[PDB]
Design a protein around this motif. Structure first.
Motif, PDB file in Angstrom:
ATOM      1  N   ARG A  65      36.329  49.865  40.973  1.00 46.93           N
ATOM      2  CA  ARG A  65      37.669  50.188  40.395  1.00 46.93           C
ATOM      3  C   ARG A  65      38.622  48.993  40.561  1.00 46.93           C
ATOM      4  O   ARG A  65      38.243  48.037  41.266  1.00 46.93           O
ATOM      5  CB  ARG A  65      38.276  51.412  41.064  1.00 46.93           C
ATOM      6  CG  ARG A  65      38.595  51.241  42.541  1.00 46.93           C
ATOM      7  CD  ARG A  65      39.280  52.436  43.097  1.00 46.93           C
ATOM      8  NE  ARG A  65      39.389  52.374  44.545  1.00 46.93           N
ATOM      9  CZ  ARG A  65      39.909  53.350  45.315  1.00 46.93           C
ATOM     10  NH1 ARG A  65      40.361  54.453  44.762  1.00 46.93           N
ATOM     11  NH2 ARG A  65      39.964  53.197  46.627  1.00 46.93           N
ATOM     12  N   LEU A  66      39.811  49.048  39.937  1.00 47.10           N
ATOM     13  CA  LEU A  66      40.850  47.978  39.994  1.00 47.10           C
ATOM     14  C   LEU A  66      42.272  48.559  40.203  1.00 47.10           C
ATOM     15  O   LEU A  66      42.731  49.270  39.287  1.00 47.10           O
ATOM     16  CB  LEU A  66      40.824  47.149  38.703  1.00 47.10           C
ATOM     17  CG  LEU A  66      41.716  45.901  38.697  1.00 47.10           C
ATOM     18  CD1 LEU A  66      41.249  44.936  39.778  1.00 47.10           C
ATOM     19  CD2 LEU A  66      41.668  45.249  37.323  1.00 47.10           C
ATOM     20  N   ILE A  67      42.953  48.283  41.335  1.00 47.82           N
ATOM     21  CA  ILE A  67      44.283  48.834  41.640  1.00 47.82           C
ATOM     22  C   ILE A  67      45.253  47.681  41.914  1.00 47.82           C
ATOM     23  O   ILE A  67      45.169  47.035  42.953  1.00 47.82           O
ATOM     24  CB  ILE A  67      44.239  49.783  42.852  1.00 47.82           C
ATOM     25  CG1 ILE A  67      43.335  50.982  42.559  1.00 47.82           C
ATOM     26  CG2 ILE A  67      45.642  50.246  43.216  1.00 47.82           C
ATOM     27  CD1 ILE A  67      43.110  51.884  43.751  1.00 47.82           C
ATOM     28  N   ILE A  68      46.175  47.410  40.990  1.00 50.97           N
ATOM     29  CA  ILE A  68      47.090  46.262  41.048  1.00 50.97           C
ATOM     30  C   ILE A  68      48.500  46.671  40.601  1.00 50.97           C
ATOM     31  O   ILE A  68      48.668  47.357  39.600  1.00 50.97           O
ATOM     32  CB  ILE A  68      46.583  45.105  40.168  1.00 50.97           C
ATOM     33  CG1 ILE A  68      45.223  44.609  40.669  1.00 50.97           C
ATOM     34  CG2 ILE A  68      47.593  43.969  40.148  1.00 50.97           C
ATOM     35  CD1 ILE A  68      44.630  43.501  39.828  1.00 50.97           C
ATOM     36  N   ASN A  69      49.522  46.206  41.312  1.00 53.32           N
ATOM     37  CA  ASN A  69      50.924  46.412  40.945  1.00 53.32           C
ATOM     38  C   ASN A  69      51.240  45.593  39.683  1.00 53.32           C
ATOM     39  O   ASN A  69      50.737  44.479  39.544  1.00 53.32           O
ATOM     40  CB  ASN A  69      51.848  46.037  42.089  1.00 53.32           C
ATOM     41  CG  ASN A  69      51.680  46.933  43.284  1.00 53.32           C
ATOM     42  OD1 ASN A  69      51.355  48.118  43.146  1.00 53.32           O
ATOM     43  ND2 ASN A  69      51.897  46.392  44.456  1.00 53.32           N
ATOM     44  N   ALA A  70      52.057  46.126  38.773  1.00 56.49           N
ATOM     45  CA  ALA A  70      52.370  45.496  37.492  1.00 56.49           C
ATOM     46  C   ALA A  70      52.973  44.075  37.657  1.00 56.49           C
ATOM     47  O   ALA A  70      53.817  43.862  38.535  1.00 56.49           O
ATOM     48  CB  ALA A  70      53.298  46.432  36.710  1.00 56.49           C
ATOM     49  N   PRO A  71      52.545  43.088  36.847  1.00 51.01           N
ATOM     50  CA  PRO A  71      53.061  41.721  36.913  1.00 51.01           C
ATOM     51  C   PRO A  71      54.588  41.657  36.720  1.00 51.01           C
ATOM     52  O   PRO A  71      55.165  42.552  36.105  1.00 51.01           O
ATOM     53  CB  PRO A  71      52.321  41.032  35.763  1.00 51.01           C
ATOM     54  CG  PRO A  71      51.060  41.814  35.620  1.00 51.01           C
ATOM     55  CD  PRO A  71      51.477  43.242  35.852  1.00 51.01           C
ATOM     56  N   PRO A  72      55.266  40.602  37.205  1.00 45.08           N
ATOM     57  CA  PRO A  72      56.691  40.383  36.944  1.00 45.08           C
ATOM     58  C   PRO A  72      57.002  40.362  35.441  1.00 45.08           C
ATOM     59  O   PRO A  72      56.235  39.819  34.643  1.00 45.08           O
ATOM     60  CB  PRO A  72      56.947  39.019  37.591  1.00 45.08           C
ATOM     61  CG  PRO A  72      55.901  38.912  38.647  1.00 45.08           C
ATOM     62  CD  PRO A  72      54.681  39.542  38.029  1.00 45.08           C
ATOM     63  N   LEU A  73      58.152  40.913  35.047  1.00 45.31           N
ATOM     64  CA  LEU A  73      58.578  40.961  33.644  1.00 45.31           C
ATOM     65  C   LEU A  73      58.834  39.558  33.068  1.00 45.31           C
ATOM     66  O   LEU A  73      59.579  38.760  33.635  1.00 45.31           O
ATOM     67  CB  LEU A  73      59.847  41.811  33.512  1.00 45.31           C
ATOM     68  CG  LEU A  73      60.357  42.029  32.082  1.00 45.31           C
ATOM     69  CD1 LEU A  73      59.349  42.864  31.305  1.00 45.31           C
ATOM     70  CD2 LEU A  73      61.715  42.712  32.125  1.00 45.31           C
ATOM     71  N   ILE A  74      58.273  39.310  31.884  1.00 39.76           N
ATOM     72  CA  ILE A  74      58.485  38.111  31.064  1.00 39.76           C
ATOM     73  C   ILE A  74      59.438  38.529  29.930  1.00 39.76           C
ATOM     74  O   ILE A  74      59.088  39.450  29.188  1.00 39.76           O
ATOM     75  CB  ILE A  74      57.168  37.554  30.495  1.00 39.76           C
ATOM     76  CG1 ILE A  74      56.231  37.132  31.630  1.00 39.76           C
ATOM     77  CG2 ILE A  74      57.443  36.382  29.565  1.00 39.76           C
ATOM     78  CD1 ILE A  74      54.827  36.808  31.174  1.00 39.76           C
TER      79      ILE A  74
END
Length: 70
Positions: free
Chosen positions: A31-40
């Motif tokens: 599985r893959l659990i990652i916090n959303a990237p910084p806003l561009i």
DNA sequence: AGCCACATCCCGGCACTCGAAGTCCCCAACTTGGATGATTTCTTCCAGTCCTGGTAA
């Protein structure tokens, strides 16, 4: 029914934020659990959305996963 | 103030015109009165088949 609940508790191990199998069910592994990237400023992405999880593994589970992943 | 490089500038020179009739001017362009009724718009039965899962007991 500890067995029914135990079978439900086991589905938690595959809750994810991003789905590595989406376009093709043949993909096998973790599985893959990652916090959303910084806003561009110039890009639409998950950066502006709140935290949510989903579930994928065996065809059979579907119902049993609904107790904890809903 | 004297010497050198590079700009153009004007006269002598050169080449062209080019075959080969003309074809009408001006001003005006219509008013009025009516466009129809009564009737009806289909029925029987049918609507394919097979191949192309991942995951764990």
């Amino acid at each position: 029914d500890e067995g029914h609940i135990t079978n439900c508790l086991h589905t938690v191990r595959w809750l994810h934020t991003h789905n590595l199998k989406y376009p093709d069910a043949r993909v096998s592994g973790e599985r893959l659990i990652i916090n959303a990237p910084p806003l561009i400023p110039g890009v639409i992405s998950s950066a502006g959305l709140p935290m949510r999880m989903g579930w994928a593994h065996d065809s059979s589970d579907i119902n049993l996963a609904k107790l904890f992943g809903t």
